């Protein structure tokens, strides 16, 4: 049946129809608008309406130009619909077949009819030259309408549903305006089934030209290029201009990002750091040498051509991660050794205090999430961390944390715990009661410590907040102490930052505390309530007060 | 026919994106949904319906059969409130068995206008094909209105058995049913089977299974003070800190004498004898903790809140409260599942148990404070869930440090 059932569309609740007066344009423009417009009515795309309809929408526009209509006002009045996922299938998930044909659909939007009662809101009055003619007042899915994509896709779905069931041997992936079909039957049968499907489309008014031979492989998808047994991104290009602008950074980062899918080792952190302000695409920012080196390294890997294999459910799914350093991580997902399904990169989520273990865990979830999306199953992980390192970490962590089934891979740099804090006080280690204060009105402040041996110290500080002195009081105790030391503090802030077990921080003082912690053999950090008169905590708090 | 239902005024239909599903779960949903469509319980929907409710598959404990599950938590909050009394005997009953009665909910149709709010989408892998869109034509499992609309029918069904066994306590939670008696387990199971046949006769893929509880064995974990003979400075420090923390719950706690022992700057490892007066202060504090906190009683209007702490060695602590420091219940689980391999599973098992204990006692689920990062919980929490309901939760990314108090 040529008729295709139309989806009911209703204007937004309590919303009126769109009425926008057409802007006066040149006569040559209206001389062509009424030209194509008459053809569309001959084709049945549009129908002239009586003067009763009040709604209106503006109409603007090689050898000739094309028509257009801005239904944004109409779109605002139009109701919300289920939206097709913007995600595009990644080739790494695409399974291998003997033949693969791509059937494009011609004028899918125009081919799809529209809800009868909604057609009143698509009126677009036609302009008249010099107002010398009465204004000329859609029957199908209009181009540019909010509900057009979903309606056309949803319409196609119901259309294709019967053919799929009748021919389960063929697999038909659905994407906007395109229809990708593959099968493992003989080449003659595949071409045969392709024609059967095209006829089923015509029976509902759908043109998928095979007369013009469908583009044979290779196929260049909008995302990347594809082949019968391999997939790769479109070739990259390197300007190598002596001076780069702001818009140069985004273009290079964007193009490099797309390359990280198949080409391992891509790094964009240094480049992104250069465009910190990114004030104006026209603004020009000088290149840094660290970023320049990143491009030089990126250029090396980019030179060699790379390809990825398609997925085989029989083969296992493996993901391998390595630490690039400075918060950068590269991973590879492969079913067969040396042959990668896909490659990617992860960057540290914004934070003030971090360590290697957590960042690795974060990468797993990022890989795990992408894997379930592209294949529907978690991969086995080859991780650069000793099983004992992980057991110590996750068991001692205060939060719940877990990593899927994984194996150790000896490829450096390995993930390790740079320092571990004792759970019980170190007997025979000098005890350091610490406290630090700072005036709110005057940034000036002080920080010091007291010990059981009588040792003491107080240091005046300037341009310091109360918390900084609390951490500053700990730095001193670490420097002026031996390899084994107990530290008693009242600062929950300092404790909450050390019980987070960081190995690199955005605060230089934290790093210097980390550096002493790495140096020391054993360190036990205890906490006591402030102003509770607990031991030397009151003695050390008084010395640093104001 | 049907009962009218509308959303709370000013609240639109729930629209929640369908989180990506494993291929195994995607297949299971297609088979369940494909048969239900044949049964007419669900029907396809076009793009006109912009609402969406998440759906995923689960397998009950010791169950090889996939059960469809829909996250109606957003729809439930948007659904207009109704207008069941919660029996206290369940907690005292020696045994309480749970039965999945959600199948009966499918017999009753639902209003057409509200059916648009039950839209759920079966996802597709690698965005290869547009996901399948379904809508409930009957009372959907996991909905708030489903147990209420069917409630009257459930009573008429359970009327004869209730009269036959008045001592037995029956309580119904959405998609579930709890039956409690003090009889022996053998007779209890027999009565349960009799009740199963009762529903079968008036009518269940999961009706045969039975979950056994013993609320009589349930007990609350109290806050205790270690009794030692050699008290070190660090012991007194930690001991004093805990007591000062517990003062918020119990004002009577005093820490003066213990602080006196701390006077002076001494090493943590040095042992400090406890003065007789300090030992008395510890004794008086030890007594105050053996007694219940005053003015602590459940308020039906206030929602329950639950917090979990990862103590370690496969041990977890939880406290259920309606006010910041007014604790209604406190306990600790141990060896739940994957005790020494996977916390996410232990936390998922803990969230379930706590909810069960909450339902048996107050007929409603608490809001959970999950000691876990959001991305960690959202990635795997679906793989270990074995219940028909889903409570509320938020994540606490700040180190409490108070776990030692809840030891
Ligand atoms: N431009 C373009 C284009 C062409 C075919 C596509 C495709 O076609 C396929 C359709 C169904 C299917 F099962 C498997 C497909 O491709 C599997 C991968 N592949 C492809 C080509 C080939 O020669 N060999 C091979 O293995 C599936 C798909 F998402 C996107 C496609 C985009
Ligand atoms: Mg102080």
Swiss-Prot record, chain A:
Effect ascribed to mutating residue 148 to T: Complete loss of polymerase activity. No loss of RNase H activity
Effect of residue 216 to A: No effect on RNA-dependent DNA polymerase activity. No effect on RNA 5'-end and 3'-end cleavages
Site (Essential for RT p66/p51 heterodimerization): 393, 406
Effect recorded for residue 159 to L: 80% loss of DNA-directed DNA polymerase activity. 23% loss of RNA-directed DNA polymerase activity
Consequence the record notes for mutating residue 217 to A: No effect on RNA-dependent DNA polymerase activity. No effect on RNA 5'-end and 3'-end cleavages
Outcome of swapping residue 219 to A: No effect on RNA-dependent DNA polymerase activity. Complete loss of RNA 5'-end cleavage. No effect on RNA 3'-end cleavage
Mutation effect (residue 398 to L): Decreased RT p66/p51 heterodimerization
Outcome recorded upon mutating residue 222 to A: No effect on RNA-dependent DNA polymerase activity. No effect on RNA 5'-end and 3'-end cleavages
Annotated compartments: Virion
Effect of substituting residue 432 to V: Slight delays in replication. Virions contain primarily p51 RT
Effect noted on mutating residue 431 to S: Almost complete loss of virion production
Catalysed reaction, written as an equation: Endohydrolysis of RNA in RNA/DNA hybrids. Three different cleavage modes: 1. sequence-specific internal cleavage of RNA. Human immunodeficiency virus type 1 and Moloney murine leukemia virus enzymes prefer to cleave the RNA strand one nucleotide away from the RNA-DNA junction. 2. RNA 5'-end directed cleavage 13-19 nucleotides from the RNA end. 3. DNA 3'-end directed cleavage 15-20 nucleotides away from the primer terminus; DNA(n) + a 2'-deoxyribonucleoside 5'-triphosphate = DNA(n+1) + diphosphate
Mutagenesis / variant outcome for changing residue 531 to D: Severely reduced exonuclease activity of RNase H, but no effect on endonucleonuclease activity
Effect seen on changing residue 434 to S: Slight delays in replication
Residue numbers covered by motif Tryptophan repeat motif: 390-406
Effect listed in the UniProt record for changing residue 159 to V: 70% loss of DNA-directed DNA polymerase activity. 64% loss of RNA-directed DNA polymerase activity
Domain of life of the native organism: Viruses
Effect of residue 179 to R: 20% loss of DNA-directed DNA polymerase activity. 21% loss of RNA-directed DNA polymerase activity
Outcome (variant: residue 159 to A): 71% loss of DNA-directed DNA polymerase activity. 61% loss of RNA-directed DNA polymerase activity
Limits of the RNase H type-1 domain: 426-546
Comment field on protein domains: RT is structured in five subdomains: finger, palm, thumb, connection and RNase H. Within the palm subdomain, the 'primer grip' region is thought to be involved in the positioning of the primer terminus for accommodating the incoming nucleotide. The RNase H domain stabilizes the association of RT with primer-template. The tryptophan repeat motif is involved in RT p66/p51 dimerization.
Misc: Error-prone enzyme that lacks a proof-reading function. High mutations rate is a direct consequence of this characteristic. RT also displays frequent template switching leading to high recombination rate. Recombination mostly occurs between homologous regions of the two copackaged RNA genomes. If these two RNA molecules derive from different viral strains, reverse transcription will give rise to highly recombinated proviral DNAs.
Record text on subunit structure and interactions: Heterodimer of p66 RT and p51 RT (RT p66/p51). Heterodimerization of RT is essential for DNA polymerase activity. The overall folding of the subdomains is similar in p66 RT and p51 RT but the spatial arrangements of the subdomains are dramatically different.
Protein's name in the database: Reverse transcriptase/ribonuclease H
Species the sequence originates in: Human immunodeficiency virus type 1 group M subtype B (isolate BH10)
Part of the full-length chain shown: 601 to 1153 of 1447
């Amino acid at each position: 049946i040529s008729p295709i059932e139309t989806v009911p569309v209703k204007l937004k609740p309590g919303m009126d129809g769109p009425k926008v007066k057409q802007w006066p344009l040149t006569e040559e423009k209206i001389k062509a608008l009424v030209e194509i417009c008459t053809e569309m009515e001959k084709e049945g795309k549009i129908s002239k309406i009586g003067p009763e309809n009040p709604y209106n929408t503006p109409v603007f526009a090689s050898t000739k130009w094309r028509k257009l209509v801005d239904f944004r006002e109409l779109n605002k009045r139009t109701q919300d619909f289920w939206e097709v996922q913007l995600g595009i299938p990644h080739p790494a998930g695409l399974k291998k077949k003997k033949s693969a044909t791509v059937l494009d659909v011609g004028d899918a939007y125009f081919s799809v009819p529209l809800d009868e009662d909604f057609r009143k809101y698509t009126a677009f009055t036609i302009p008249s030259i010099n107002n010398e003619t009465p204004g000329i007042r859609y029957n199908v899915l209009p181009q540019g309408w909010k509900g057009s994509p979903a309606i056309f896709q949803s319409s196609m779905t119901k259309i294709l549903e019967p053919f799929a069931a009748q021919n389960p041997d063929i697999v038909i992936c659905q994407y906007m305006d395109d229809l990708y079909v593959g099968s493992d039957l003989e080449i003659g049968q595949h071409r045969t089934k392709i024609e059967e499907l095209r006829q089923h489309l015509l029976r509902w008014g759908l043109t998928t030209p095979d007369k013009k031979h469908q583009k044979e492989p290779p196929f260049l998808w909008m995302g990347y290029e594809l082949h019968p047994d391999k997939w790769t991104v479109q070739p990259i290009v390197l300007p190598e201009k002596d001076s780069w602008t702001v818009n140069d950074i985004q273009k290079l980062v964007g193009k490099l990002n797309w390359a990280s899918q198949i080409y391992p080792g891509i790094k964009v952190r240094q480049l992104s750091k250069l465009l910190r302000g990114t004030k104006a695409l026209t603004e020009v920012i000088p290149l840094t040498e660290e970023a320049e080196l990143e491009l030089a390294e990126n250029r090396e890997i980019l030179k060699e051509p790379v390809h990825g294999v398609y997925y085989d459910p029989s083969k296992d799914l493996i993901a391998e991660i390595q630490k690039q350093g400075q918060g950068q991580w590269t991973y590879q997902i492969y079913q067969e050794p040396f042959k990668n399904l896909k490659t990617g990169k992860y960057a540290r989520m914004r934070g003030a205090h971090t360590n290697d273990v957590k960042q690795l865990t974060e990468a797993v979830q990022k890989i795990t999430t992408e894997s379930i999306v592209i294949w529907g199953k978690t991969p086995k992980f080859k991780l650069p961390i000793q099983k004992e390192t992980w057991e110590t970490w996750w068991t001692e962590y205060w939060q719940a944390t877990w990593i899927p089934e994984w194996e150790f891979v000896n490829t450096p740099p390995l993930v390790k715990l740079w320092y571990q804090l004792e759970k019980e006080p170190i007997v025979g280690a000098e005890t350091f009661y610490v406290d630090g204060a700072a005036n709110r009105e005057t940034k000036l402040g002080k920080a010091g410590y007291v010990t059981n041996k009588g040792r003491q110290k107080v240091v005046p500080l300037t341009n310091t907040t109360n918390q900084k002195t609390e951490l500053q009081a700990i730095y001193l105790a670490l420097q002026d102490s031996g390899l084994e030391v107990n530290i008693v503090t009242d600062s929950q802030y300092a404790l909450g930052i050390i019980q987070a077990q960081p190995d690199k921080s955005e605060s230089e003082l934290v790093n210097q505390i980390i550096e002493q912690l790495i140096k020391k053999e054993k360190v036990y950090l205890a906490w006591v309530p402030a102003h509770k008169g607990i031991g030397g905590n009151e003695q050390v708090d008084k010395l640093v007060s104001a | 026919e049907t009962v009218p239902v509308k959303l709370k005024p000013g609240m639109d239909g729930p629209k929640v994106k369908q989180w990506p599903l494993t291929e195994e779960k995607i297949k299971a949903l297609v088979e369940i949904c494909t048969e239900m469509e044949k049964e007419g319980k669900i029907s396809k929907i076009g793009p006109e319906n912009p609402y969406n409710t998440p759906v995923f598959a689960i397998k009950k404990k010791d169950s090889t059969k996939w059960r469809k599950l829909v996250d109606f938590r957003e729809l439930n909050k948007r659904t207009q409130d109704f207008w069941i009394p919660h029996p206290a005997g369940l907690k005292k009953k020696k045994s309480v068995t749970v039965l999945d009665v959600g199948d009966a909910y499918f017999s009753v149709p639902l209003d057409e206008d509200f059916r648009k709010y039950t839209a759920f989408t079966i996802p597709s892998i690698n965005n290869e094909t547009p996901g399948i869109r379904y809508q409930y034509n009957v009372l959907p499992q996991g909905w708030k209105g489903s147990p209420a609309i069917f409630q009257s029918s459930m009573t008429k069904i359970l009327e004869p058995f209730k009269k036959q066994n008045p001592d037995i306590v029956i309580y119904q939670y959405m998609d579930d049913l709890y039956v409690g008696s003090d009889l022996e387990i053998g007779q209890h199971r027999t009565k349960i089977e009799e009740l199963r046949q009762h529903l079968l006769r008036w009518g269940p893929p999961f009706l045969w299974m039975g979950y056994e509880l013993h609320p009589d064995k349930w007990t609350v974990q109290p806050i205790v003070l270690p009794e030692k003979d050699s008290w070190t400075v660090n012991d007194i420090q930690k001991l004093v800190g805990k007591l000062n923390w517990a003062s918020q719950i119990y004002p009577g706690i005093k820490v003066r004498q213990l602080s006196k022992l701390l006077r002076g700057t001494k090493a943590l490892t040095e042992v400090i004898p406890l003065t007789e007066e300090a030992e008395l202060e510890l004794a008086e504090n030890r007594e105050i903790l053996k007694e219940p906190v005053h003015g602590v009683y459940y308020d039906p209007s206030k929602d329950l809140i639950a917090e979990i702490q990862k103590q370690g060695q496969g041990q977890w602590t939880y406290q259920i409260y309606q006010e910041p420091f007014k604790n209604l219940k406190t306990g600790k689980y141990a060896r739940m599942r994957g005790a020494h391999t996977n916390d996410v599973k232990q936390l998922t098992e803990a969230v379930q148990k706590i909810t069960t204990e909450s339902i048996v006692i107050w007929g409603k689920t608490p809001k959970f404070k999950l000691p876990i990062q959001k991305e960690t919980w959202e990635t795997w929490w679906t793989e270990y869930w074995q219940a028909t309901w889903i409570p509320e939760w938020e994540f606490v990314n700040t180190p409490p440090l108070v776990k030692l108090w809840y030891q």
